[PDB]
Amino acid sequence: PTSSEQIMKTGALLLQGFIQDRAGRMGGEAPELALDPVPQDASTKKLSECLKRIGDELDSNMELQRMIAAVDTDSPREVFFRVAADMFSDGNFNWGRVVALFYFASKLVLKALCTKVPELIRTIMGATLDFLRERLLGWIQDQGGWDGLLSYFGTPTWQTVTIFVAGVLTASLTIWKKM
């Protein structure tokens, strides 16, 4: 539950489930994912549904979409890390930054699927989970695991929470664009 193995596993399945959902929206079963889909249990599915709803709102943030559409790199891992390290360089973590990270990593993977480069999939997911372990694992264990993500976004004005999620990601992309 709060074990490092469960926290890593849930992070992997959350990232996978979000990518697979967007993959299916664009191409049904056609996209070559190159990671085996894992059936999700009841608790993890609730987290995946939360991330799905936040992802849809982030998709409708114009400034953020402009910034993400502006990344066109042969090395998505390098921009992923620049954004990840900047976002968490302040040392004041909360679930909105975690969500923004998983959202941005998923978009990087989707641009690889959409360009028929399935090896970037494992590279980006590997980097995301490595970053999860090195930077975020201690804080998530302190929170009691992933369940608190659900509390964070469980309010009627979750869209106002999501302004700050989009905001922190836009700020780190602006940093990377000036690097």
Swiss-Prot record:
Mutagenesis or variant effect for residue 172 to D/E/H/K: Constitutive cytoplasmic location
Q: Which domain of life is it from?
A: Eukaryota
- Family matches, as PROSITE patterns: BCL2_FAMILY, BH1, BH2, BH3
Effect annotated for changing residue 55 to R = In a T-cell acute lymphoblastic leukemia cell line; loss of heterodimerization with Bcl-2 or Bcl-X(L)
Instruction: Quote a single Gene Ontology cellular component term.
Output: Bcl-2 family protein complex
Consequence of substituting residue 178 to R: Partial loss of polyubiquitination
Q: What tissues is it present in?
A: Expressed in a wide variety of tissues. Isoform Psi is found in glial tumors. Isoform Alpha is expressed in spleen, breast, ovary, testis, colon and brain, and at low levels in skin and lung. Isoform Sigma is expressed in spleen, breast, ovary, testis, lung, colon, brain and at low levels in skin.
Note the position of the cross-link Glycyl lysine isopeptide (Lys-Gly) (interchain with G-Cter in ubiquitin): 116, 178
Tell me, which GO biological process terms does this entry list? Answer: apoptotic mitochondrial changes; apoptotic process; apoptotic process involved in blood vessel morphogenesis; apoptotic process involved in embryonic digit morphogenesis; apoptotic process involved in mammary gland involution; apoptotic signaling pathway; B cell apoptotic process; B cell homeostasis
The record, for InterPro entries, names: Bcl-2-like_sf (IPR036834), Bcl-2_BH1-3 (IPR046371), Bcl-2_fam (IPR026298), Bcl2-like (IPR002475), Bcl2_BH1_motif_CS (IPR020717), Bcl2_BH2_motif_CS (IPR020726), Bcl2_BH3_motif_CS (IPR020728)
- How changing residue 62 to D/E affects the protein? Strongly reduced interaction with MCL1, BCL2, BCL2L1 and BCL2L2. No effect on cytochrome c release and subsequent apoptosis triggered by etoposide
Signal peptide positions are none
Q: Which residues cross the membrane?
A: 160-179
One molecular function GO term is: protein homodimerization activity
Q: According to the UniProt entry, where does the motif BH2 sit in this chain?
A: 138-153
Q: Which PANTHER family match?
A: APOPTOSIS REGULATOR BAX, BCL-2 RELATED
Give the domain note.
Intact BH3 motif is required by BIK, BID, BAK, BAD and BAX for their pro-apoptotic activity and for their interaction with anti-apoptotic members of the Bcl-2 family.
Q: What role is this protein assigned?
A: Plays a role in the mitochondrial apoptotic process. Under normal conditions, BAX is largely cytosolic via constant retrotranslocation from mitochondria to the cytosol mediated by BCL2L1/Bcl-xL, which avoids accumulation of toxic BAX levels at the mitochondrial outer membrane (MOM). Under stress conditions, undergoes a conformation change that causes translocation to the mitochondrion membrane, leading to the release of cytochrome c that then triggers apoptosis. Promotes activation of CASP3, and thereby apoptosis.
Q: What is this protein called?
A: Apoptosis regulator BAX
Q: Which organism is it from?
A: Homo sapiens (Human)
